[PDB]
Swiss-Prot record:
GO terms for molecular function: ATP binding; enzyme binding; JUN kinase kinase activity; magnesium ion binding; MAP kinase activity; MAP kinase kinase activity; molecular function activator activity; protein kinase binding. This is Dual specificity mitogen-activated protein kinase kinase 7. The active site is at residue 136. The lineage of its organism: Eukaryota, Metazoa, Chordata, Craniata, Vertebrata. It catalyses: L-seryl-[protein] + ATP = O-phospho-L-seryl-[protein] + ADP + H(+); L-threonyl-[protein] + ATP = O-phospho-L-threonyl-[protein] + ADP + H(+); L-tyrosyl-[protein] + ATP = O-phospho-L-tyrosyl-[protein] + ADP + H(+). Belongs to the protein kinase superfamily. STE Ser/Thr protein kinase family. MAP kinase kinase subfamily. Its EC number is 2.7.12.2. One of its GO terms (cellular component) is nucleus. Residues 236-259 are annotated as: DVD domain. It comes from Homo sapiens.
Length: 260
């Protein structure tokens, strides 16, 4: 408590040193008046729900243990007052869900490539360094900034259609601009489709690489038995192809945010 550590440089700080630039979507965009630094601040009210206050505390514990993972949002510090805790986090430009809403259609494979590399490495790091299997990988969990960094959101970072499956559905939704269970009226109707219907694979007519379609087919393997672990996805050729390959995520992002 009492410090913001940004870049490798530590500053003494209190909550009043921060200027509220408004809600992001209870994460605030705040400016550290001392420096000009613009950060994200989660506010946890002491009067709040006890279960979800325990989640925030467990999520923070993991975040603080993940300094060495570039693919997870980092914590700069915390402030504790009589009624609140303020958690200072890396600021990111937007999440993939908002990014799809703004775009109003498909996100290009090259972007989803860099995205998949970052998110699978985050999810592998969580499993192999903290014994966490992340429940729900959704587009709202995937953050991007205008330096082209992609990082996993810290929500639920401490937990027959979760994990690898949820990443598969995330990628189809973003690659097509269409949530595959769009026309379902209830969560129950959705679970019905997952169990009874063929997996919602990528269309064959959009110029998606074999690697991308293969990757998604593997995530959407219905049978728990034959369904791959983060360990194996981390070896998939879709990952090998985009892991090394150069993609100007920065310009692409700026282009989008400017044109919308």
């Amino acid at each position: 408590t009492g410090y913001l550590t940004i870049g490798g440089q530590r500053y003494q700080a209190e909550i009043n040193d921060l200027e509220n630039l408004g809600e992001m979507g209870q994460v605030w965009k705040m400016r550290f008046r001392k420096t000009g630094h613009v950060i994200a601040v989660k506010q946890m009210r002491r009067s709040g729900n006890k279960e979800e206050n325990k989640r925030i505390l467990m999520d923070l514990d993991v975040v603080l243990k993940s300094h060495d993972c570039p693919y997870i949002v980092q914590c700069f510090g915390t402030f504790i007052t009589n009624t609140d805790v303020f958690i200072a986090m890396e600021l990111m430009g937007t999440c993939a869900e908002k990014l799809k809403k703004r775009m109003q259609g498909p996100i290009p494979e090259r972007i989803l490539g860099k995205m998949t590399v970052a998110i699978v490495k985050a999810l592998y790091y969580l499993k192999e360094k903290h014994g966490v299997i992340h429940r729900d990988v959704k587009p709202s969990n995937i953050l991007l900034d205008e330096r082209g960094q992609i990082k996993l959101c810290d929500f639920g970072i401490s937990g027959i259609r979760a994990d690898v499956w949820s990443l598969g559905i995330s990628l189809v939704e973003l690659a097509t601009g269409q949530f595959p269970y769009k026309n379902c009226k209830t969560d129950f109707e959705v679970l019905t489709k997952v169990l009874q219907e063929e997996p919602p694979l990528l269309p064959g007519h959009m110029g998606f690489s074999g690697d991308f379609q293969s990757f998604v087919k593997d995530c959407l393997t219905k049978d728990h038995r034959k369904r791959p672990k983060y360990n194996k996805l981390l070896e998939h050729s879709f990952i090998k192809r985009y892991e090394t390959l150069e993609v100007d995520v920065a310009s692409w992002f700026k282009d989008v945010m400017a044109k919308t």
